[PDB]
Amino acid sequence: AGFGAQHRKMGKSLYLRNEVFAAWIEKVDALVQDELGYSVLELILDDAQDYGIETTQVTIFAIQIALGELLRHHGAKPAAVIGQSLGEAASAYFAGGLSLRDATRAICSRS
């Protein structure tokens, strides 16, 4: 729970029962595991309450990247169908052309 509890429920159920969504969740989880120590996939699956600002932002970030890329897999520009619902980082990735790498290390900080 906390902020993005629904993002975590939806993200877990989608990770289990959708291979594209799961592929993107893994793709982001490796990147955060490179930029940080922990793993976002652990946090999503282990549906624990999260009041930490950074880890919540990272969870919502990965969930939105995977949902947006799942929509893109069905042939729609993600910023055109859920652009208003994106966080600063996911929107920076889908609308600002920011690389997933720079986005991941942008939400981590730590500075």
What can you see in these coordinates?
- The chain is globular.
- The protein contains 6 helices and no strands.
- The N and C termini lie far apart (25 Å).
- The chain has one domain (1-111).
- Helices cover 64% and strands 0% of the residues.
- With 111 residues, the protein is mainly α.
- Number of domain units: 1
Ends apart, CA distance between termini: 25 Å
Q: Give me the number of helical elements.
A: 6
The ordered H/E elements are HHHHHH
Protein name: Polyketide synthase Pks13
In short:
The protein has 111 residues and is mainly alpha-helical. It has one domain.
Task: Please write out the topology.
Elements lengths: L4 H12 L2 H17 L4 H6 L7 H21 L14 H7 L5 H8 L4
Protein traits:
111 residues; mainly alpha; globular; transferase; fragment
